[PDB]
Task: structure prediction
Amino acid sequence: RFSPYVFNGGTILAIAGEDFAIVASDTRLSEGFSIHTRDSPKCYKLTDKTVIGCSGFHGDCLTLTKIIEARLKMYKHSNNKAMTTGAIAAMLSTILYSRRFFPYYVYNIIGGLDEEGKGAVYSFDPVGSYQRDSFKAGGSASAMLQPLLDNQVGFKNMQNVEHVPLSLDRAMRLVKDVFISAAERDVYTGDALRICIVTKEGIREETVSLRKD
Amino acid sequence: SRRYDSRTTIFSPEGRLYQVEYAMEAIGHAGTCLGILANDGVLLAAERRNIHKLLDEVFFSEKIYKLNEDMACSVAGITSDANVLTNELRLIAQRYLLQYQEPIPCEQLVTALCDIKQAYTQFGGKRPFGVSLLYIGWDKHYGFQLYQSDPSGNYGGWKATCIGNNSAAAVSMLKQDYKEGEMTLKSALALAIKVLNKTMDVSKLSAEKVEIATLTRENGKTVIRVLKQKEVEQLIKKHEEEEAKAEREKK
Amino acid sequence: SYDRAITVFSPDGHLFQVEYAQEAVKKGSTAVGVRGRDIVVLGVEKKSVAKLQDERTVRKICALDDNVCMAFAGLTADARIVINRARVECQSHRLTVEDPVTVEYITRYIASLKQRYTQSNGRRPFGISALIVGFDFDGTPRLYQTDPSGTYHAWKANAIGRGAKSVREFLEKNYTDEAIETDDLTIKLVIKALLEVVQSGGKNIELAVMRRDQSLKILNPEEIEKYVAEIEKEKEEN
Amino acid sequence: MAATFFGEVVKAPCRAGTEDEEEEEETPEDREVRLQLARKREVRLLRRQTKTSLEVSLLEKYPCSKFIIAIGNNAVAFLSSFVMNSGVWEEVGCAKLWNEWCEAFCVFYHLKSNPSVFLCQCSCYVAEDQQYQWLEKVFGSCPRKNMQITILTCRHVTDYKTSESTGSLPSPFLRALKTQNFKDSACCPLLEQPNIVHDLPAAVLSYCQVWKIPAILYLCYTDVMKLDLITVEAFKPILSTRSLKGLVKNIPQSTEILKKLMTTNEIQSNIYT
Amino acid sequence: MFRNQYDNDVTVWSPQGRIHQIEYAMEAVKQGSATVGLKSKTHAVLVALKRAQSELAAHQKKILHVDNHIGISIAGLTADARLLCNFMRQECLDSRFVFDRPLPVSRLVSLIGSKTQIPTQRYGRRPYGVGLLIAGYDDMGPHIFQTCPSANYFDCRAMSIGARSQSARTYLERHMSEFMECNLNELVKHGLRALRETLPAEQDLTTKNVSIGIVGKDLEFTIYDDDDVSPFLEGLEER
Amino acid sequence: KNELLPSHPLELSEKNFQLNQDKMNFSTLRNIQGLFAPLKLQMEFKAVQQVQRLPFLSSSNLSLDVLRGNDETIGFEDILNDPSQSEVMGEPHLMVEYKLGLL
Amino acid sequence: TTTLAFKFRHGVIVAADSRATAGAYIASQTVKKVIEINPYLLGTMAGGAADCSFWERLLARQCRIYELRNKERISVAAASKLLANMVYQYKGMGLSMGTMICGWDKRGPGLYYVDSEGNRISGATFSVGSGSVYAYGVMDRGYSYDLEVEQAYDLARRAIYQATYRDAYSGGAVNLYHVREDGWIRVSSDNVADLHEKYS
Amino acid sequence: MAERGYSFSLTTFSPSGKLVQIEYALAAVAGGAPSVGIKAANGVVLATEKKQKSILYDERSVHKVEPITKHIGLVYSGMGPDYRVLVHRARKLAQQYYLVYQEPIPTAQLVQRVASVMQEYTQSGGVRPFGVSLLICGWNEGRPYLFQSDPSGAYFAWKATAMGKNYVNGKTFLEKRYNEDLELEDAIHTAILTLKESFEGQMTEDNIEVGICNEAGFRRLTPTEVKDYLAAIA
Amino acid sequence: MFLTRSEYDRGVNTFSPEGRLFQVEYAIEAIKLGSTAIGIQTSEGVCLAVEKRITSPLMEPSSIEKIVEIDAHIGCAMSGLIADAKTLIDKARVETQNHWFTYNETMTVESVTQAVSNLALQFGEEDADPGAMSRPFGVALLFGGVDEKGPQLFHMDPSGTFVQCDARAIGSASEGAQSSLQEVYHKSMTLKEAIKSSLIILKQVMEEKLNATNIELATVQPGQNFHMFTKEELEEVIKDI
Result:
C-alpha cells in the first residue's frame, strides 16, 4: 500500500540556562537502512531569540518549518512586533493540533530566551501538547540522552551534591558528550553536531564532527 | 402614493405595506365565500362565481378543497396561488401526520400557511399570495373551528365570517343574525342561504351559483360532504318561503 | 430616494426605513408592562371587541418560556415569527447551556434578529416592538423593551404602541415603591394605565400575570372587571 | 434606480428633477408636518448681541455702500485672516438656518469707522429653497443700487468645464463674473461660456443684475477645499485690486501669519489620508 | 450635462466612450495626501507626507510593510489600501512558500492590476480608489511602480501622487539624472525636497509629518518615523 | 464529523451527479470551445436559478432544464424521490436565511 | 496518570500526579495535569494530554466570551455541558479525553466528570485515570463530607501517593488544589519520594 | 389612473388589486391564431388554424396540435416557442407520472401540473408569464376531457370553447351550436364551422390543423381526412 | 447653461465627481447624531467618559451601556447606532479571545482596533456569500486600553480607519469637546486631572444637569484592569469638579 510517513532519524536536544538557550542536533538524514545525506541540521532558527528543532519525517518537518516562518511573518505584519518564544510555542501547539487526525510526524523542541532573558525550552509531541522545561532531548536517541541530562543538569539521584548553576561551557561539554554517546550507540546519529547557542547578543552556530557509521 | 409600493418591502412614512393592501383589494375583487360555525358542525358556503353554460364541472368541489380527513378549506382570490397554497396545506398536514401519527390541529396548519405567506411578504422580489382562505376543521383540543387567513399572513378564529365580494355586508348580517351558543347546523345553513341571497344581488340563488360544504362528526369520524344541488335548492326554497311569510305578516 | 432603501443613509444620517417600521409599531395597539417585587404583569389594549371572533386566536401576550413572557405591538405576522424564533432559541439555550434562559439573553437574541433583518435592503425590518418580561435564574424581576432597529432597553415600566407617550407619562407619575411592593398594587396600576389608554376599558383589557416561580397565566374577564370595579371605587372615594 | 432585486423595475433619473414633482402631485397631518418642515428650514435672521430678532432687513435698518460676502470655509478664512486684523469688525446680525446637508454659521460684520461698509462670512450651506429667503431677509425688497458687492467663493476644479482635463488644469486658478453695472476691471479671466454657478453667490449676483447693482463674483477653483493656504494665496489678487484695497491695511505680514493660524487648526479627512 | 445617466454606474459606457467612475476614482486618489517615490541605481526610497486629523490625534501612517523587500506608499482610500496591502502580503507569502524565493515586484504589480481590473468590469462593485507607489528590490535592481485606481500600472524612476503632487513631479523630472547616480542620503534628500515642493511655501517638513521607507541591495524595507527620520532631515537645504 | 465519510462508494458520485455532469460539460467545452462557453453557461445557469420560488416551495426550474438539455431526459433522480413530497420542511424564514448565507 | 477530585464542606479538592509516559518510557515528570480554566473554574488531564489541553483551553476561551457577553460568570454545569457537546461532536474520531470540571457557582461547589465518550455526570467523589482505582479505594475508605481542610489535603495526598505506588504510569508530584467561593488556590506540590519518606 | 409603474412590474400589485402583466399576457393570447376545442360524448376535437404566410412552408416541419402521450393532446393560441417548451414539460411530467404509478396520467393531473408551472413562472420577479393558453384534451376512465390553462395558471374544464382572435364570437357560436349529447365526427364539423367564422379566406387542408381524441387515443388528423371533412361540410 | 439633478448620494459603491464616497460621509453624520463620548490618553492610564441619554426616568440607567469591556485591559466607548456598536464589540471580544487562545498572550490595542476596522470596511467589497455589511457601520468607537506599550487610545470611524489619538471626542458636540480637550490637554497630565477635565467638558456640552445617573465613566490603568466607575465614585468626582 501507500505509507504517508517514514522515519528519517535525527536527534534534537535543547538546554536552558540563565542567559543562554542551547539548541543542538545531529546532521544524519537516514531513511531505512541507508543514509540520505550527511549534512542536514535539524535545528532551524526562527527569530533572534528562538531556535526550533524538528526530528522525524523530513517532509513534515520541512512543511512545518515553512508554515512557522509564514506565520511569524504574518504575526510581524499584523501586530508590528516579533513573536515571543512562548507565543511561538502556543502557535506551534495550535498548528500541530490542527492536523490532529493526520498528525505531523515531527518531534519539536523550541529553545530560546524569554522576555526576561532566561533560557526557555518547550517540548512538543506530534499531537501538540507542550510544556516548559529546563532541558529536553528528542528524536531517535531521546531515551538515551535524557537520563544523563537528569543526572547532571537536574542533579537527580545525587546525594550530597552542590547544585551549581549551569554554565555555558559546562552545557556545551555536556551536549558534546551526550551526542558522542548517541553516535556510539544510536545508528541514526553521527556525522556532525550543529549547536545553536541563543544568547542576548545573537545566535552562534557550532559544528562538531561525530563518528561516521 | 406611487411609491413605497414597488418592491413589496418598503415601509411607508406612516408604516404601511401598500402591496399587502393591494393584495387584500384583489381578494375583495374575488367571489363571495362564507363560513358559519355551529355546535352541530361548521360549514362553508361559497359562491361558485363562474357560471358559464359551456363550462364543465368535472371536480366534486369547484372551489372547496379538502385538506385532510379532519379539515377542509375554501378560497377567495387568485386561483393558481390558491392551488399552490392548498397543495402546501395538504403537504404540511401530511407531514404532521407522518411525524406524530395524529391529525394536525387546525390552528397549526393555519399558522404554518400564514408563516409561508408572511415569509413571501417579508422578502423582496416575491409577489405576495393574493389568496384569502377560510378553514373548517375538527380537532381533539378545541373541537369544531373556523379560521380565516389573509394575504398579509394574519389569521383569526371566527364563529361567523365572510371573505370576498360584499364581505362587510355579510359580516354585519352575521353579527345581526348569529346566536352564540344556540346556533345549530340547520339554522346555520338557513343563515348562510339568507346571507348569500342578500349579498349576491344578481338574482335569487339557483343552487348553481353557490356551493355549500358541511363538516360534522359521526360515529367519532369527521364527515366532510358537499351538499347536493337538490339540497341547496330545498334550502333556497325554504328561505324564500320564510321571506314570503314574513312579508305577508308585515302587511 | 433616501427614505425608500433600508441600506441607504440619509444626508442627516437617518435610516428612514427603520423609522417607518417604528411608525408601523406606533400604529399598533397599546401594550403596557410594569415591574414589581416578585411580580411582573403585562397588559394589552384590544383595538376593538370584535364579535364572532375567538379571543384565544388573537392574543397579544404569549410565553416564550416557562419563566419569560412577551407582548408586542405592530404587525401580527412579524410578531408571530419573532415569537416562534424566540421560543426555538430559548429551547436551544436550555439544551446547550442546560440553564434556564435569562431575560437578557432572549432580549439580546430578539434584538439581534431584528437588526439582522434591518441589515440588508432585500429583507424588510420586523415592524414590531416587544416587551420581554420575566424572572432570571435568581428570581429577579426583569422588564425589557426592543425596537425594530435592534436596540433593547430595560425599563421599570414601559408602554408601546398607539398612545404610548401618554401611558408612559401616567406610569412615570404613578410609579412608587409601595405600588411595586404589592402585587395587587401593580395589577391595579396596569389597569389604571390601560383605562387611561382606552376610555371604554372593561372587556378590552387583556392582562396577564406572572409571579415568582409561577408560569404565565392570563386573568379572565371576570378578574379584569373586578379590578376595574376596584379602581372605580377608589376613584369614587376621592 | 433601486435594483434591490433581480426583476426590480428601475427608472432613469431626470436631470430636470421632474420625477420629484410627478410624485408630489391633502391630508391634514401631512400638511401640518410639511408646514413644520417649512418653518424649520426657513432662515431666521437675528443677532446674538442683546438677542434682538431682526425682523427688519439689514439693508433697510442700516444703509450700506460696500458688502463683501464670503461663502465657503476658505473664503471666510481669507477674510478673517486679512480684513479683521486691519481694523475692527463687530458682529451685527447672524442668520440661522437648518438644512438636510449641515463652525457652520452666517455672521455679518460692519466697520466701526465706516458703518456703510458691511461683511458676511457664510461658512454654512444654504439649500436651493432658502437663498431667496436669505436675500429677502438681508437685502429686503427695495435695493439701493449703490453698493459695491464683492462675492467670494470657492469651487472644485472638477466643476470647471474645458477641453483640457481636470488634472492638466492648474489647480489654484480663479475666475470672475461681474454684472452689467460693475464697470471696474475684473482683474481675472471671465468665466467660460458653458460654466455655470448655482449656489448662494449665483443668487446674490442674479439679484444684483436684476436690480441694477454693481457686483462682481469671484470663483477660486481648487482641487482641495479643507482650509488650504494656497486658496487664500490665490485669493490675494482680490485684495490687490480696488474695493478691498482700503479695507485691508498695508500689513500683509500679520495677515500671512494669521492665515497660517487658520490652516494649522484644520481637520483632516479620515477616509483619505 | 448629458452624462448624468452614464455617470452613476461603472458598467455603463458613455457616448464619448469613457467610464466616468474610473475617472472619479482617480479624483479620489488625487484627493489624498501626497507621496514621493524615487529610486537610485541601488536604493528605492518612499517619502510620504503624513496627515493628522487633529493636533492631538497622531499622524496616520502612510508607509506600509509588504515583504522583506517590498513596500508601498498610501494615497487615497484607506480601506481599499488595507485590502490591497493584505492581498499583496498574501501573494508574497505564497511565493516564498512555494518557490522559496522573493516575489518579483513586476509580477506582484501585474497581479494587483488584474485584481483591481476585476471590479471595474462587473456590476455592483466600485474601482479601488487607492493609488500606491511600490518600492522594491529584485535581481533587476530597485523598482518604483505606480498603481492607479484604474487597473493600469506604470513603471517609473520617480513619481509623486496625491494632492499638490504636480510640484513634486516637476522637481523629480528636473533631477532625474541626479537621482539615477547618487548616494542613498542624496536620494532621500531629493525625495524630501520634492515633498517640500508639494507643501506650501510657509509650511516646512517636520519629524512628525515625514515618513520614509527605504529598500536597497543589502538593506531590507525599513520605515523611519520621527526620531528615525530626524537624521535625514538634518542637513537639508533651506527652501 | 463521520457524516463527511461516504457510507457508499457510489453515494458520493451519485449525490453530486448533476454537479459532476455540469463540470464535465464545462471541461469539455473549455478543452474544445474555450473559456467563453463555460463562462456563458455558468452565467446563464446563475441567471435562471436566481429567479425561482423560495426555498420552502418546490421550484420547477424549467429554463434550467432546457439550458442543461434535461427538458426531454428522465433519470432515476426525477422519479425515485419527489422534491415536492419532501416529508421534511423547515421554517420558511429559516430556509430563506440559510439560502441567503446568513445561516 | 491518576486524578483525584472530591467536594467536601469547605469546597472542592483537586489532586493529580505529574507523570506523562509515552509507552514504557517516561516522557516527563513535571507535567501539570490540572488545567486552570478560569480564576474560579479548573479541570484535570487524563488520557490524551494534547486532546485534554486543547479542548480545555477552548472551553476556557468560550467561558471568557460567555462572561464578557452576559456579564456573569459561567456556572460549572454550563461549562461541563459545553465541553461535553464539543467532545461529542467529534465522537468516534479517536479522542481520548478524561477530565473533571471543578468549580464554585451560585449553586455551590461543583464537580462534573466529562470524557470523550460523551457521558457527563455530577457527584461527590470522582477519579479518572489509569491509577484511578487505587485512589478510588483510598479516598472511599478515607472520605467524609464533614472533613477539615487539612484532613482533606492529607486524604488527597495519600490517595495520589498510593495510586502512584501501585500504578506504573503514575508518579512525580501531587499537584494539590482547593476550590473555594473566592476562587481556587494552589496548595502544594509534594514529590512522591518525599511522601514515601514521610508516610514510611 | 395611469398606473404605469404598476403595469411595468409583474410582482407589483395595482391599487385596485389587478396583475397587469397577466392581463397583457392574456391579450397576447387573444392576439394569437384562433383555436377551437369541443368535448363531444364520443370524444373531444381540437381544431386550430395554422396561418401560413407563404406557400413555401413545410407542413410537416411544425405542428400546432401536438401529442403529449398516447391519449392526451393539446393546442395553443399565442406564442409558439412558449407552447413548444410547455409541450416538452408536459411530456416529461406525463412520463414521470407513468414511471412512478405505472398508469397513464389522467388529463386533470397533467393540467394541474402545467398550471403549477405557469403559476411558478408568473410568481417570481425576473421573468415574464407564458403568453400562451393551452387547450388540453384527453380520455380517461372512458370519459372525454377538455381543459384550458390560462397564462396565470387558472385551469377550467370546458365542454366547448374557443381562444385566439375573435374568441368571444367563437364562444357565442359554440353556445348556439354545441349540444349536450353531440358525438364526434360532428363536433369536428362544428369546430370547422367555428374556424370558418374566425377565418379570413378559404380553409384548405394545409390552412388548418385538426386533432381528435377518443377511446383509442389522441390522433392528429392527416391532411386528407381534414380535406374530406371540409368537403363534407361544404 | 441648464442645471442638472446629478445624484451620486444613493449608491455606496458610487464615486462623486470629486472622488468622495457620500455614504461614508452620511455614516459620519449618523455618528454626529450620537451622544458625546470623550476619551483621554495619559501616562497613568486611559479615561473614557460618555453621557447617558435617559429619555425617561423609568428606563434603567444601567441598561444604557455605552462603555463596555473588550478585554480585561481594553475598553471601548461607542457613539452612534447602538446595534452596530454591539456587533463590533462582539467581533472585538471574539478576536481578543482568539488571539489569547492562539498565542497565549494579550492582544495589542492596535491589533484589536485593526481587526474591528477590517470588519468595518466590508460594504460591497466582502465578496462573501453570507450576508455582509451592506451599509457602512453607523457607529464610531474609542478603543481605550493599556498594553505593553502603555496607555493607548484609538478612534475608529465608519470608513474603517483607526488613528491613535491622545484625546478624542466623538458625538453631537464632538467639535466643541475636541476644542476644549485641545485647550486643556497636556502630555504630563495625571489620570485624575484627565478625569476632571473630561467631566467638566461633558458638563459643558450636555443640555442636561450632570449627575451620576446620566453619565458613564471608566478607566484602564497599567496596574488595575478595566474598571467601571460606580455611582459613589461618580458622585465624588462631580463634587470635586
Chains E and C do not touch (no CB pair under 8 Å). Strands of chain E lie at 35-39, 43-49, 63-65, 70-73, 132-138, 141-147, 153-156, 158-161, 210-216, 222-225.
